[PDB]
Amino acid sequence: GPSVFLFPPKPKDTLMISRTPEVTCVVVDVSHEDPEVKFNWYVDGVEVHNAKTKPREEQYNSTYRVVSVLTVLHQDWLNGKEYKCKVSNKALPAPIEKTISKAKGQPREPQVYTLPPSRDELTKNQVSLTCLVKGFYPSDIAVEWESNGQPENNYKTTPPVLDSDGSFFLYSKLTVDKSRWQQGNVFSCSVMHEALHNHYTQKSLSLS
Amino acid sequence: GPSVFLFPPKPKDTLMISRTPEVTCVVVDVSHEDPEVKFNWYVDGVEVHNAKTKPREEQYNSTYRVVSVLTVLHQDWLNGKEYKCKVSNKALPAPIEKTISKAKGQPREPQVYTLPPSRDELTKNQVSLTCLVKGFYPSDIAVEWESNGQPENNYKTTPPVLDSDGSFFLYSKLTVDKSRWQQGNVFSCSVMHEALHNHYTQKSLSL
Numbered sequence: 001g002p003s004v005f006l007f008p009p010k011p012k013d014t015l016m017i018s019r020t021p022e023v024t025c026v027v028v029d030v031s032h033e034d035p036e037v038k039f040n041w042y043v044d045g046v047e048v049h050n051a052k053t054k055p056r057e058e059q060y061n062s063t064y065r066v067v068s069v070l071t072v073l074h075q076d077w078l079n080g081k082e083y084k085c086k087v088s089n090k091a092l093p094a095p096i097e098k099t100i101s102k103a104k105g106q107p108r109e110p111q112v113y114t115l116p117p118s119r120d121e122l123t124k125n126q127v128s129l130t131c132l133v134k135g136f137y138p139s140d141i142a143v144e145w146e147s148n149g150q151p152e153n154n155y156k157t158t159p160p161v162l163d164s165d166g167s168f169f170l171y172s173k174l175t176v177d178k179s180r181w182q183q184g185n186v187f188s189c190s191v192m193h194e195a196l197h198n199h200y201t202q203k204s205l206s207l208s
Numbered sequence: 209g210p211s212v213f214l215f216p217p218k219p220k221d222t223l224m225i226s227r228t229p230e231v232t233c234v235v236v237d238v239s240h241e242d243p244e245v246k247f248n249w250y251v252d253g254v255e256v257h258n259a260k261t262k263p264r265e266e267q268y269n270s271t272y273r274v275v276s277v278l279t280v281l282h283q284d285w286l287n288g289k290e291y292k293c294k295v296s297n298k299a300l301p302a303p304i305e306k307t308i309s310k311a312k313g314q315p316r317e318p319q320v321y322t323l324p325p326s327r328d329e330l331t332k333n334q335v336s337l338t339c340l341v342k343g344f345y346p347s348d349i350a351v352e353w354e355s356n357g358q359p360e361n362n363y364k365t366t367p368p369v370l371d372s373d374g375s376f377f378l379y380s381k382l383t384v385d386k387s388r389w390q391q392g393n394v395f396s397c398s399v400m401h402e403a404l405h406n407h408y409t410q411k412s413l414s415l
């Protein structure tokens with residue numbers, strides 16, 4: 001029969017009060033013969049009725065895909081409430097239930113260090129600016145780069161890696177033209193995480 | 209019926225002449241009623257005969273596990289030859305064949321940079337020494353830290369990450385007591401990869 005996948009809000013959405021975090025319930029392999037789908041939503045067991053469901057969408061493998069979106073409160077998600085999606089369909093003997101909640105664990109504050117290019121890399125046309133983010137827990141986190149108040153997006157960030165003390169670390173690498181570095185332009189690594197004060201910190205990096 | 213899993217050599221094994229790279233053919237769920245297992249091995253379609261096979265070993269679920277190991281030549285593996293394991297068993301309508309080979313794609317040479325701790329971290333009891341390895345392809349690679357003729361224990365390396373130009377990068381983080389760093393000890397990041405000259409390079413870092 002059909003299948004359900006339940007997805008969390010984005011970390012940045014839960015950590016910045018101005019943004020709009022959502023939980024999303026996706027149902028796939030919904031047949032043409034029985035396309036009717038009912039969603040029930042629960043927060044710590046209590047039904048809520050503010051979910052928005054989008055219309056059937058025919059796939060290329062001749063099935064329907066149907067999506068329901070629940071807006072969540074920032075502080076409910078961060079406080080560990082459980083979000084349950086129940087999907088009912090004529091083709092299901094019993095409805096499918098999926099539950100999701102924030103990654104558990106005692107929070108630990110990321111330490112954020114910026115590292116300039118190696119001298120050896122200055123022979124290249126482009127150089128690497130590095131942000132080390134370590135000692136954090138749980139692993140949900142957002143790391144971004146900017147300069148003069150504007151996003152610098154030519155970067156890649158590693159997945160979180162479990163360290164030997166049970167916390168996580170990652171590195172983000174921003175590539176910039178060497179000339180911008182050598183001209184003394186200032187770059188900053190921004191980190192958003194539940195265990196930071198105001199859920200945000202920034203560290204700068206430039207050539208002296 | 210029985211099942212076959214074919215495993216490659218470890219990348220480091222293929223890169224250093226001192227080591228012995230092997231391909232391993234394991235067959236599981238071999239029955240008591242039909243316990244006989246025959247291996248045939250091929251390299252680019254040509255049968256080879258120097259594989260070493262171990263005797264059946266009964267498992268706690270009352271089936272046998274039987275392993276055949278083929279030693280490979282380092283340069284054959286790196287040159288992309290294909291290794292085929294054919295497994296024959298009376299309980300099989302037809303023999304099972306599995307094939308394995310090195311990852312494809314144009315190789316690219318890693319660039320290796322060591323980075324000292326940030327000034328802000330020097331207030332801590334332990335500090336982080338960083339090895340950036342970038343611009344490499346394929347993603348198979350070994351990264352190790354040493355100091356004073358001995359490997360270091362407290363390091364972790366990220367998985368390879370696909371960069372915007374289609375090569376990979378990673379970072380390796382070595383944690384040492386601040387005192388060792390301040391005393392001027394030299395640390396070294398060694399990298400082994402098929403696209404390096406002699407498949408090896410090293411970069412050092414000290415205060």
Ligand SMILES: *[C@@H]1O[C@H](CO[C@@H]2O[C@@H](C)[C@@H](O)[C@@H](O)[C@@H]2O)[C@@H](O[C@@H]2O[C@H](CO)[C@@H](O[C@@H]3O[C@H](CO[C@H]4O[C@H](CO)[C@@H](O)[C@H](O)[C@@H]4O[C@@H]4O[C@H](CO)[C@@H](O[C@@H]5O[C@H](CO)[C@H](O)[C@H](O)[C@H]5O)[C@H](O)[C@H]4NC(C)=O)[C@@H](O)[C@H](O[C@H]4O[C@H](CO)[C@@H](O)[C@H](O)[C@@H]4O)[C@@H]3O)[C@H](O)[C@H]2NC(C)=O)[C@H](O)[C@H]1NC(C)=O
Pocket residue numbers: 003005007008009010021022023024026028029059060061063065
């Ligand atoms: C017929 O076709 C359909 C769909 O059409 C195909 O789908 C695409 C992907 C291509 O493959 C093409 O072939 C077609 O277009 C098939 O539907 C697929 O079924 C799969 C199951 O058989 C299912 O696999 C599971 O994937 C999970 C991951 O899903 C992610 O990621 C995939 C790939 O990265 C992506 O395609 C999905 O869209 C989904 O992506 C996320 O979607 C959410 C929802 O919007 C995005 O939303 C953001 O998230 C939050 C929400 O609150 C936030 O608030 C934001 O507001 C919001 O924007 C989110 O951004 C997306 N993330 C990413 C990274 O993209 C896996 O987790 C899962 O594995 C786990 O479970 C398995 C089962 O137990 C385990 O084996 C496993 O170990 C794991 O535990 C599955 O592998 C596909 O997702 C699903 N595809 C779609 C589009 O729904 C259908 O199967 C097929 N039928 C037949 C018979 O062929």
Ligand SMILES: *[C@@H]1O[C@H](CO)[C@@H](O[C@@H]2O[C@H](CO)[C@@H](O[C@@H]3O[C@H](CO[C@H]4O[C@H](CO)[C@@H](O)[C@H](O)[C@@H]4O[C@@H]4O[C@H](CO)[C@@H](O)[C@H](O)[C@H]4NC(C)=O)[C@@H](O)[C@H](O[C@H]4O[C@H](CO)[C@@H](O)[C@H](O)[C@@H]4O)[C@@H]3O)[C@H](O)[C@H]2NC(C)=O)[C@H](O)[C@H]1NC(C)=O
Pocket residue numbers: 211213215216232234236237267268269271273
């Ligand atoms: C009776 O008991 C038997 C022994 O206990 C059971 O045997 C087990 O059978 C299953 C399949 O039914 C096999 O599962 C496969 O494992 C592959 C990986 O195996 C490696 O890693 C596991 C986990 O650590 C380890 O136990 C294995 O021994 C093996 O280790 C590797 O061995 C090689 C060769 O010596 C060595 O070079 C490696 O270094 C070493 N690695 C490590 C980490 O130690 C999986 O990759 C297989 O995946 C298949 O299925 C996937 C499904 O998504 C698919 O994506 C893949 O592409 C692939 O098709 C597969 O899951 C077990 O390995 C096997 N155990 C042993 C010891 O052989 C037997 O099942 C049981 N029978 C019954 C009826 O109960």
